[PDB]
């Protein structure tokens, strides 16, 4: 059903911020619940952040966090471009990882990264010091 691509990556200083974008294609990102997950060089996959596709008010998407980003991230969505960005503030060492979004159409299962429909290719961060 959808095809998803990451992008954004790159090598950042600790401090800085980086954007990076979860691009459809083939469908519209519109009806799917978009989540984040990151994977760091030996670890296991760990859930960061996930956007609803229905309106909570004008101009907000039901939106959850986990716990070691939650006011650093702060994930969007932009039907319009078929894309979900992902703003990441204050980067750290240990943030360093391949990040990818994933697709999947429902609510539930709930921040493991074994339920999901469609996954995207990965984007490598690094942040140095």
């Known amino acids: 059903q959808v095809q998803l691509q990451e992008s954004g990556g790159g090598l950042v200083q600790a401090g800085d911020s980086l954007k990076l974008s979860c691009e459809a294609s083939?469908?519209?990102?519109?009806?799917?619940?978009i989540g984040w997950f990151r994977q760091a060089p030996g670890k296991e996959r760990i859930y960061l952040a996930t956007?609803?596709?229905?309106?909570?008010?004008?101009?907000?998407?039901?939106?959850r966090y986990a716990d070691s980003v939650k006011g650093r991230f702060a994930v969007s969505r932009d039907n319009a471009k078929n894309t979900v960005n992902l703003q990441m503030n204050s980067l750290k060492p240990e943030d360093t990882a391949v990040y990818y979004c994933?697709?999947?159409?429902?609510?539930?299962?709930?921040?493991?990264?074994?339920?999901?429909?469609?996954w995207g290719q990965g984007t490598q961060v690094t942040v140095s010091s």
């Open positions: 994933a697709a999947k159409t429902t609510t539930w299962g709930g921040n493991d990264p074994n339920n999901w429909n469609y």
């Open positions: 956007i609803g596709r229905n309106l909570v008010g004008p101009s907000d998407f039901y939106t």
């Open positions: 083939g469908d519209s990102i519109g009806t799917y619940v």
